[PDB]
Amino acid sequence: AKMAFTLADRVTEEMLADKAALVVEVVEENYHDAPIVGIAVVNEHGRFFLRPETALADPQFVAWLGDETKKKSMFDSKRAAVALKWKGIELCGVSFDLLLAAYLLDPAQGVDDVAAAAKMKQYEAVRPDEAVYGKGAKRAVPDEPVLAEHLVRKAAAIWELERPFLDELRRNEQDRLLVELEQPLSSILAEMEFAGVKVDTKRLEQMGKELAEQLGTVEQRIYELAGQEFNINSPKQLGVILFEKLQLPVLKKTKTGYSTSADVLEKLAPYHEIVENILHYRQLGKLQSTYIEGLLKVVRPDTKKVHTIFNQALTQTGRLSSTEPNLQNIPIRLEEGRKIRQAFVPSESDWLIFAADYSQIELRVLAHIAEDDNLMEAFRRDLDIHTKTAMDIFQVSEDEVTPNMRRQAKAVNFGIVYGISDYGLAQNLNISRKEAAEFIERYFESFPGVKRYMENIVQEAKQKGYVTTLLHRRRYLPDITSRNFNVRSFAERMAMNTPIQGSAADIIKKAMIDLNARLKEERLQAHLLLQVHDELILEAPKEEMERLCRLVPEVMEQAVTLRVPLKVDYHYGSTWYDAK
DNA sequence: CGATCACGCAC
DNA sequence: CGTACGTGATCG
Ligand SMILES: OC[C@H]1O[C@@](CO)(O[C@H]2O[C@H](CO)[C@@H](O)[C@H](O)[C@H]2O)[C@@H](O)[C@@H]1O
Ligand SMILES: OC[C@H]1O[C@@](CO)(O[C@H]2O[C@H](CO)[C@@H](O)[C@H](O)[C@H]2O)[C@@H](O)[C@@H]1O
Ligand SMILES: [Mg+2]
């Protein structure tokens, strides 16, 4: 059953053909400055394994890697490209990435190794990575014969599966989505991750100290008000204090005990002074554990940068996610947590942080896809969309919209985008199902095009088996035909929400590609650092701000043409916090 | 010692 | 009511 290959001791010309499947193996999950443990090449001339110390010191091999006219097919080329950037080696000419291809064909399969992708086309002559390397404490690179066979089998699978994957993408009208959107984006994400974001660790450490002080003060107040010391971070020890010793009302349960989620606590606050303190303690503790201690844990001590990894092949809607650290969930709503962003600073002297965000991109996308006359007109007038929604559903003039009315209309707008449900809206606004249902009815009366869209997209999902986004991303929804109400209803909300969230993802991905091309044409030093779903964060010399103020919003606004304008706001400053 | 829960942070 | 990730506590 074994697969034949040459275990090479040196690089030869036949390993440098102008088309090959290439494996540059990095086993560490976080590939930043990580070891390359082996290399495999499969091409018209045969199958080869190379030790990295050999290949990466070979000028002909390094030149071949960097030659855009020598085409490579890979799985997770970003991992290889970043590991190689840390070694000062450029990887070019990647014309097919099997991870991205599998992800576009069906994000729900959770493909995260070559074996998983291969199994989609009944190809099973390759082992799962976890079977070869193990996981956790037991993880390890195996001896060379085992490692080499595995890497060659992966390269061989890629070599075989490129054509059938590309053919299916073409049938789905997704080939341009792979080749013109996701693959070029992967190179841009590699650059962003490698550049990293500079952290002011002294500032973080100062914050940590002050937080520790306040945590102590609140911890003691809590013990004083409880008349006893306990582990506040145990939802179970806390449940006893709250609902037994102090007799607070049980407004909600969890399947293992009493709920102490913030929504429940907020309702209990009027009964006892301890509750406000538990909330404050939780807020501070979140900042301390996750955003100070957690961040400091992953800052590289030499450069004081953090280098996130953007998972490009995970979310079911086409968004990116971010890990180690997650730079897509840094606090902003509450001023206390917002100050964390003061610690993210430009990487060079006299540079600044520039941040540009789409204004209401999801509702603008909804206006476009639903062709709702009222919603399109609202955005053509650049109205405050929550005030407008309040005017319509509560039937009042702009003057007559109160803050509470705008607040409830805002929640309705979220619900509509998420996949509206009377129960979920009711939970969010703390009102009755019947009341939430009345709001939803008034909304559909004011935006009948949106109502028609929500009905039609659920029927389309049922008919075709999937829904699609602007640039032809797809999500299969098998549960749409379930005879279980709750299962089916969740699938219906995904049918409604995915073309909205996913088309917004497509637009900002295209914007990133267009922006990098413009930055290069203009030879600006400015470069992307982060994407947070509907916003792009850059750093640049202070002397480039004026040019960026014009260039970045324009590129983002013009990335696609919709039936309504796109609008981008922007800010810049000496830290991420100040880019407001 | 990995897997799970409950919770809270972003958009 | 949609999409994510990290944490401390607990589970087994
Ligand atoms: O390299 C990213 C790419 O690798 C995958 C596995 O194929 O995820 C791995 O890499 C991560 C980043 O360090 C981890 O978060 C993840 O646990 C790990 O399996 C893909 O999911 C991802 O696109
Ligand atoms: O009465 C129609 C109304 O119900 C929805 C669910 O909110 O869909 C239901 O009715 C459809 C048939 O008309 C079914 O295909 C569907 O499976 C069922 O849940 C809405 O789509 C809708 O317009
Ligand atoms: Mg915004």
Question: Distances from the Cα of A342 to the Cαs of A292, A388, A527, A569, in angstroms?
Answer: 12, 35, 20, 20
User: Assign residue A122 a region: left if phi > 0, alpha if psi is -120 to 50, beta otherwise?
Assistant: left
Ligand that lies nearest to the alpha carbon of residue A97, given by its number in the listed order: 1
Q: Read off the tokens for A291.
A: 């955003």
Q: Read off the tokens for A271.
A: 């009964």
State the CB neighbour count (10 A cutoff) for residue A87. 12
- Alpha carbon A267 to its chain's center: 32
Name A349's Cβ contacts closer than 8 Å, sequence gap at least 6.
Answer: none
Q: Whole-angstrom Cα distance, residue A506 to residue A471?
A: 6
Q: Whole-angstrom Cα distance, residue A128 to residue A114?
A: 7
Question: Helix (H) and strand (E) counts for chain A?
Answer: 24, 19
Q: Whole-angstrom Cα distance, residue A320 to residue A314?
A: 7
- Neighbour order of strands in the sheet with A344-345: A305-306, A197-199, A344-345
- Among A120, A172, A175, which residue's Cα sits nearest to residue A474? A172
Gap from CA of A481 to ligand 2 centroid (Å):
11
Cβ(A230)–Cβ(A241) under 8 Å?
A: yes
The residue written with tokens 């319509």 in the block is A392
- Among A297, A294, A296, A289, which residue's Cα sits nearest to residue A215? A289
Q: Which neighbouring-strand residues pair with A72?
A: A20, A94
DSSP-based three-state secondary structure for A312: coil
Q: Read off the tokens for A333.
A: 């709503």
CA A339-A345-A348 angle, 5° bins: 165
Q: Whole-angstrom Cα distance, residue A528 to residue A195?
A: 9
Q: Read off the tokens for A112.
A: 């995260």
Q: b/e string for A156-187 if b means 16 or more Cβ within 10 A?
A: bbbbbbbeebbebbeebebbebbbebbbbbbb
DSSP-based three-state secondary structure for A178: helix
DSSP-based three-state secondary structure for A363: helix
- Helix, strand, coil percent content, chain A, rounded in steps of 5: 55, 15, 30
Q: What does DSSP say about strands A474-476 and A527-531: parallel, antiparallel, or unpaired?
A: unpaired
The experimental method, as deposited, was X-ray
Q: Which residue is nearest to nucleotide C4 (CA to C1')?
A: A321
- SS3 sequence, A113-130? CHHHHHHCCCCCCCCCHH
Q: What does DSSP say about strands A6-8 and A46-50: parallel, antiparallel, or unpaired?
A: parallel
Q: Which neighbouring-strand residues pair with A330?
A: none
Q: Could you tell me if the CB of A80 is within 6 A of ligand 1?
A: no
Q: Whole-angstrom Cα distance, residue A528 to residue A514?
A: 12
DSSP-based three-state secondary structure for A294: helix
State the CB neighbour count (10 A cutoff) for residue A565. 12
Name the residues around ion ligand 3, CB cutoff 5 A.
Answer: A 357
The half-sphere exposure of A534 on its side-chain side, counting CA atoms within 13 A, is 18
Q: What does DSSP say about strands A38-43 and A344-345: parallel, antiparallel, or unpaired?
A: unpaired
Q: Whole-angstrom Cα distance, residue A527 to residue A507?
A: 19
Q: Read off the tokens for A139.
A: 């993880």
Name A297's Cβ contacts closer than 8 Å, sequence gap at least 6.
Answer: none
Name A263's Cβ contacts closer than 8 Å, sequence gap at least 6.
Answer: none
The alpha carbon torsion through A513, A518, A521, A527 (nearest 10 deg) reads -80
Q: Whole-angstrom Cα distance, residue A441 to residue A147?
A: 61
Q: Whole-angstrom Cα distance, residue A580 to residue A575?
A: 10
Q: Read off the tokens for A332.
A: 């902003």
Q: Whole-angstrom Cα distance, residue A503 to residue A500?
A: 5
The residue written with tokens 């960026």 in the block is A548
State the CB neighbour count (10 A cutoff) for residue A543. 12
Question: Distances from the Cα of A137 to the Cαs of A28, A112, A132, A133, A142, in angstroms?
Answer: 12, 20, 14, 11, 14
Phi, psi for residue A489 in degrees, rounded to 5? -65, -35
State the CB neighbour count (10 A cutoff) for residue A551. 18
Q: Whole-angstrom Cα distance, residue A321 to residue A312?
A: 7
- Equal fold, A195-309 vs A310-360+505-579: no
- Whether the ω angle into residue A325 lies within 30 degrees of 0, i.e. cis, is yes
Q: Could you tell me if the CB of A510 is within 6 A of ligand 1?
A: no
Name A521's Cβ contacts closer than 8 Å, sequence gap at least 6.
Answer: none
DSSP-based three-state secondary structure for A230: coil
Q: Which residue is nearest to nucleotide C7 (CA to C1')?
A: A290
Q: b/e string for A221-245 if b means 16 or more Cβ within 10 A?
A: bbbebbeeeeebeebeebbbbbbee
Cβ(A25)–Cβ(A77) under 8 Å?
A: no
Using the CB atom, is residue A324 less than 7 Å from strand C? yes
The half-sphere exposure of A184 on its side-chain side, counting CA atoms within 13 A, is 16
Q: Where are the alpha helices (DSSP H) in A172-234?
A: 175-176, 183-195, 201-226
A373-380 and A448-464 helices, crossing angle to 10°: 120
Q: Is A152 exposed, middle or buried (0-12, 13-18, 19+ CB in 10 A)?
A: buried
Q: Is A247 exposed, middle or buried (0-12, 13-18, 19+ CB in 10 A)?
A: exposed
Q: Is A409 exposed, middle or buried (0-12, 13-18, 19+ CB in 10 A)?
A: buried
- Neighbour order of strands in the sheet with A6-8: A6-8, A46-50, A38-43, A19-25, A71-74, A94-97
- Ligand 2 mutation target, pool A425, A440, A450, A455, most atoms within 8 A of CB: A455
Q: Could you list the beta-strand ranges (E) of A331-464.
A: 344-345, 351-358
State the CB neighbour count (10 A cutoff) for residue A337. 17
Which nucleotide C1' is nearest A308 CA? C5
Report the CATH architecture of A310-360+505-579. 2-Layer Sandwich (3.30)
Provide the CA A299 to C1' C11 distance, Å, integer. Answer: 32
Cβ(A154)–Cβ(A126) under 8 Å?
A: yes
Cβ(A170)–Cβ(A152) under 8 Å?
A: no
The alpha carbon torsion through A297, A298, A303, A305 (nearest 10 deg) reads -120
Q: Whole-angstrom Cα distance, residue A194 to residue A171?
A: 35
Cβ(A326)–Cβ(A308) under 8 Å?
A: yes
The alpha carbon torsion through A39, A40, A44, A46 (nearest 10 deg) reads 120
- Among A524, A516, A537, which residue's Cα sits nearest to residue A355? A537
| DSSP-assigned letter for residue A36 | P
- Among A475, A512, A562, which residue's Cα sits nearest to residue A180? A512
A361-370 and A373-380 helices, crossing angle to 10°: 140
| DSSP-assigned letter for residue A343 | G
Ligand that lies nearest to the alpha carbon of residue A455, given by its number in the listed order: 2
Phi, psi for residue A476 in degrees, rounded to 5? -80, 140
| DSSP-assigned letter for residue A35 | P
Question: Distances from the Cα of A480 to the Cαs of A163, A462, A488, in angstroms?
Answer: 31, 6, 5
Q: Which CATH class is domain A361-504?
A: mainly alpha
Q: Could you tell me if the CB of A462 is within 6 A of ligand 2?
A: yes
Task: Report the CATH number of the A1-194 domain.
Answer: 3.30.420.10
Phi, psi for residue A563 in degrees, rounded to 5? -75, -10
| DSSP-assigned letter for residue A3 | P
Q: What does DSSP say about strands A535-541 and A351-358: parallel, antiparallel, or unpaired?
A: antiparallel
User: Assign residue A29 a region: left if phi > 0, alpha if psi is -120 to 50, beta otherwise?
Assistant: alpha
For this experimental structure, what is the resolution in angstroms? 1.7
Q: Whole-angstrom Cα distance, residue A448 to residue A497?
A: 17
Question: Distances from the Cα of A124 to the Cαs of A48, A96, A142, A160, A357, in angstroms?
Answer: 20, 20, 21, 12, 44
Cβ(A197)–Cβ(A305) under 8 Å?
A: yes
Considering all CA atoms of chain A, what is the largest pairwise distance in Å, rounded to the nearest integer? Answer: 80
- Among A188, A184, A198, which residue's Cα sits nearest to residue A307? A198
Q: Is A502 exposed, middle or buried (0-12, 13-18, 19+ CB in 10 A)?
A: buried
Ligand that lies nearest to the alpha carbon of residue A114, given by its number in the listed order: 1
Question: Distances from the Cα of A203 to the Cαs of A200, A281, A289, A343, A344, in angstroms?
Answer: 5, 21, 16, 6, 10
Q: Given CA atoms A553, A554, A559, A561 in this order, what sign does their dihedral have?
A: positive
Q: Whole-angstrom Cα distance, residue A387 to residue A408?
A: 10
Which residue, by CA, sits nearest to atom 7 of ligand 1? Answer: A112
* CATH superfamily label, A195-309: Taq DNA Polymerase; Chain T, domain 4 (1.20.1060.10)
Q: Read off the tokens for A56.
A: 């990466």
The residues of the protein lying within 7 Å (CB) of strand B read: A 135-138, 235, 254-257, 259-263, 265, 279, 282-283, 286, 290, 328-334, 337, 532-535
Residue ranges of domains in chain A: 1-194, 195-309, 310-360+505-579, 361-504
Q: Read off the tokens for A250.
A: 């049980």
